[PDB]
Amino acid sequence: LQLQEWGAGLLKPSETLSLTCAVYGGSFSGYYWSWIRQPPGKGLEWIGEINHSGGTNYNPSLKSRVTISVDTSNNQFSLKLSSVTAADTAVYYCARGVWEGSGSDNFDYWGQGTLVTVSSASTKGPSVFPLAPSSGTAALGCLVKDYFPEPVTVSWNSGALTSGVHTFPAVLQSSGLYSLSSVVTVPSSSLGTQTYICNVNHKPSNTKVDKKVEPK
Amino acid sequence: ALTQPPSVSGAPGQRVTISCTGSSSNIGAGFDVHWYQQLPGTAPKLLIYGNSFRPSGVPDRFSGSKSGTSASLAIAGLQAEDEADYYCQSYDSSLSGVVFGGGTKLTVLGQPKAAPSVTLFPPSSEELQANKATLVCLISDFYPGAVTVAWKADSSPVKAGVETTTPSKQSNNKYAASSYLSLTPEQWKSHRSYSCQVTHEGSTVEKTVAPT
Amino acid sequence: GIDKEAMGFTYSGIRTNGATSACRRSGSSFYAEMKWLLSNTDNAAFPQMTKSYKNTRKSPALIVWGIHHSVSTAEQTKLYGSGNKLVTVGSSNYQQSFVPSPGARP
Amino acid sequence: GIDKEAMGFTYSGIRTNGATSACRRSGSSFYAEMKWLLSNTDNAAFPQMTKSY
Numbered sequence: 001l002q003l004q005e006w007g008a009g010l011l012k013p014s015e016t017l018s019l020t021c022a023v024y025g026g027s028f029s030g031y032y033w034s035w036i037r038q039p040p041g042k043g044l045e046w047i048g049e050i051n052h053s054g055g056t057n058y059n060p061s062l063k064s065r066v067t068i069s070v071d072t073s074n075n076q077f078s079l080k081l082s083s084v085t086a087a088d089t090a091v092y093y094c095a096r097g098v099w100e101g102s103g104s105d106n107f108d109y110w111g112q113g114t115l116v117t118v119s120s121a122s123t124k125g126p127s128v129f130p131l132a133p134s135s136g137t138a139a140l141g142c143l144v145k146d147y148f149p150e151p152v153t154v155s156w157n158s159g160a161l162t163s164g165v166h167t168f169p170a171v172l173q174s175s176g177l178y179s180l181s182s183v184v185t186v187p188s189s190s191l192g193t194q195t196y197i198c199n200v201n202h203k204p205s206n207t208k209v210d211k212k213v214e215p216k
Numbered sequence: 217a218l219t220q221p222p223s224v225s226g227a228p229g230q231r232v233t234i235s236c237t238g239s240s241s242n243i244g245a246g247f248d249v250h251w252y253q254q255l256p257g258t259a260p261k262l263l264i265y266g267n268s269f270r271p272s273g274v275p276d277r278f279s280g281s282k283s284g285t286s287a288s289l290a291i292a293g294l295q296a297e298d299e300a301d302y303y304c305q306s307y308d309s310s311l312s313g314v315v316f317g318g319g320t321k322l323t324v325l326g327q328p329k330a331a332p333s334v335t336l337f338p339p340s341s342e343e344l345q346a347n348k349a350t351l352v353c354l355i356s357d358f359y360p361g362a363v364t365v366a367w368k369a370d371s372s373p374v375k376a377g378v379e380t381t382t383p384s385k386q387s388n389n390k391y392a393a394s395s396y397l398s399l400t401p402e403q404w405k406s407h408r409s410y411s412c413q414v415t416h417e418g419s420t421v422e423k424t425v426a427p428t
Numbered sequence: 429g430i431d432k433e434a435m436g437f438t439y440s441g442i443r444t445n446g447a448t449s450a451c452r453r454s455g456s457s458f459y460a461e462m463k464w465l466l467s468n469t470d471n472a473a474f475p476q477m478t479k480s481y482k483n484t485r486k487s488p489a490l491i492v493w494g495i496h497h498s499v500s501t502a503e504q505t506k507l508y509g510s511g512n513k514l515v516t517v518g519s520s521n522y523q524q525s526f527v528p529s530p531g532a533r534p
Numbered sequence: 535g536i537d538k539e540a541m542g543f544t545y546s547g548i549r550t551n552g553a554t555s556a557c558r559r560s561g562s563s564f565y566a567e568m569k570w571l572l573s574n575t576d577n578a579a580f581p582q583m584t585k586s587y
Contacts, residue, residue: 041380041382042318042319043316043318043319044303044305044316044317044319045316046313046314046315046316057313059311059313060311060312060313061311093259093260104314105248105250105265105307106248106250106262106265106305107252107262107305108262108271109262110259110260110261110262111259112259113259127346129340129342129343129350130340130342131337131340131352132340132341134428139335141337143337143340143343143350143352145343145350166354166356166392168354168392168393168394169381169384169392169393169394170381171379171380171381171394171396173379173396174379179379179396180394181337181352181354181394183335183337183354216428
């Protein structure tokens, strides 16, 4: 029993997420047919299901915002979500649910999953701030903030100090923009005399920045 | 409304337990609890249904139960290939629908337990002069790849603003992750001191920063 | 032997497709000559109903119905809505009324 | 004859010590093989339980 869903990928807020999932090897009316989503971080939410007869079973917290149709003929069933916020960015699965009473009891033979990122925009550049050290050795870094899309170079002194560097991975925040922070630990006695310039580079947004870190 | 632990350790073979704690409205009713196995990058597969009954393909290893207001999965005979996230599932009548758990991350040997390295950073003087504030919690050099960050204004925990990330392999084949607290400048000034406490198997690292 | 005849019942504003996986017919299904009367959506109030049948034929009829005892009070209010439930059955020489006893059986 | 075996019922959240002056065993007692399940305090709620053997 195969199960694979396709449809819209990226869409901007206040639009209408539309998906549709196709089945191979089975037939409707034996069971219920459900859409289950998973945010990229954590959790698992059941949005609704339907049977051959068009009989639906909807999540009340998403009713008045969700409509699930069924194409009994073409062996596929759809999904309409109507005023999409940024909270709807998640992986969407279709799955067959074992009909037990009223609607399904568990789910066997899940689909594969399609990602639906719902964010607004766009090729932006980063705001970069200094991470001062305080108070053996100390740590200081840079803060690349609110940029899109990856990647970015976080060199220290144009590529002259790697010993002690630790570039962290980005974070896709709810606004759709990215953010990272590369830090370096260095001796606290020479903090001091030497100077540290982090030279962020963003070829996607063409911009280059050279910000210097100093203590208080 | 199904509270699972976020992480579980384990050496190969050894039995390991996953809790699935629920309320009087989901498992405190006649609603069975089932489990699903999500291997990384894959769809979930059906594990135990009907609280103990395993489908065709599931080894003797996987064994579950339900008691009172909670369920418990048992993985005895930990293989390498059991690295996955496990979810429980049942029916909650208060939501009038089916509910899952948050999920538990199954981690196996062999790099020994590694305590994390937490470096906290207060808002930059430049950022406070844009009417923004960003506290930055940096987490390095821990194993396994399963930590839970908790932010606390002096006593009260901070609910919103957090943007924690998924741990990833360092060069050292350890794991690392960052967490970002977004604050307004008057929120940063109107409290004694904000703390970042990262939780790992037994260790709870509490780094702390204050406005100076 | 037996000869069956449609009762001719017609339902509106409810679900008549309550089924189960214990009665397999290419997936979940129910008794052939019965229907599992469900509320139109989960936990919704079940509208009070009354249905009637006349035996036009010359031999007596075998009328069989079922009272459903749900696993839990919670499940009962999921299938048929909250509140007390009652089913009364009437004929010329029969009048009994059944209250479901929900609870767990093995 | 009859040979007895305990069915192993545990209780929590209720009282099990109901007794009466009609089953008088040097005081007020109850049936030997039975337990009179009550509620913790007078007029308190009895919670719905399920016990198998």
